[PDB]
Curated annotation (Swiss-Prot):
Stated role: Component of the 40S small ribosomal subunit. Plays an important role in controlling cell growth and proliferation through the selective translation of particular classes of mRNA. Part of the small subunit (SSU) processome, first precursor of the small eukaryotic ribosomal subunit.
Section of the entire sequence shown: 151 to 200 of 249
Subcellular location: Cytoplasm; Nucleus, Nucleolus
SUBUNIT field: Component of the small ribosomal subunit. Part of the small subunit (SSU) processome, composed of more than 70 proteins and the RNA chaperone small nucleolar RNA (snoRNA) U3.
Name by which UniProt lists this protein: Small ribosomal subunit protein eS6
Family: Belongs to the eukaryotic ribosomal protein eS6 family.
PTM comment text: Ribosomal protein S6 is the major substrate of protein kinases in eukaryote ribosomes. The phosphorylation is stimulated by growth factors, tumor promoting agents, and mitogens. It is dephosphorylated at growth arrest.
Gene field: RPS6
Domain of life according to the entry: Eukaryota
RNA sequence: UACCUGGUUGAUCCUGCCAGUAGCAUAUGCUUGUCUCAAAGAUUAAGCCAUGCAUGUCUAAGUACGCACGGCCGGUACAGU
């Protein structure tokens, strides 16, 4: 399942500005950038053996 | 700049020390217009200390749900300060 969309949201209300909602940055999500760092980590091992 | 002078006797020649003469660095007295440098609670007590200051620190790159401030609307991890 997708871990996004199920994340809890916090509503903001005050007399001045419009309503808003907040949610946190997620800390173990395995995005494409995490996978890209894992690929270079093993490309450096191959280069040293050559 | 490798230098001496007064003082023992009625007078002389010596020994020998006292006093004078020049510099240096601590205190102290009288006196003082301009201008460039600049030592300064060591000496006695490593004695006793009111008050203030004398050591802090963030980048594109460890952790941002602070309505704290904010956008054109939306969290697509999640904007931005």
């Amino acid at each position: 399942d997708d871990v996004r969309q199920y994340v809890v949201r916090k509503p903001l209300n005050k007399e001045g500005k419009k309503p808003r909602t907040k949610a946190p940055k997620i800390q173990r999500l395995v995005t494409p950038r995490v996978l890209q760092h894992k690929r270079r980590r093993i490309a450096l091992k191959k280069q040293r053996t050559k």
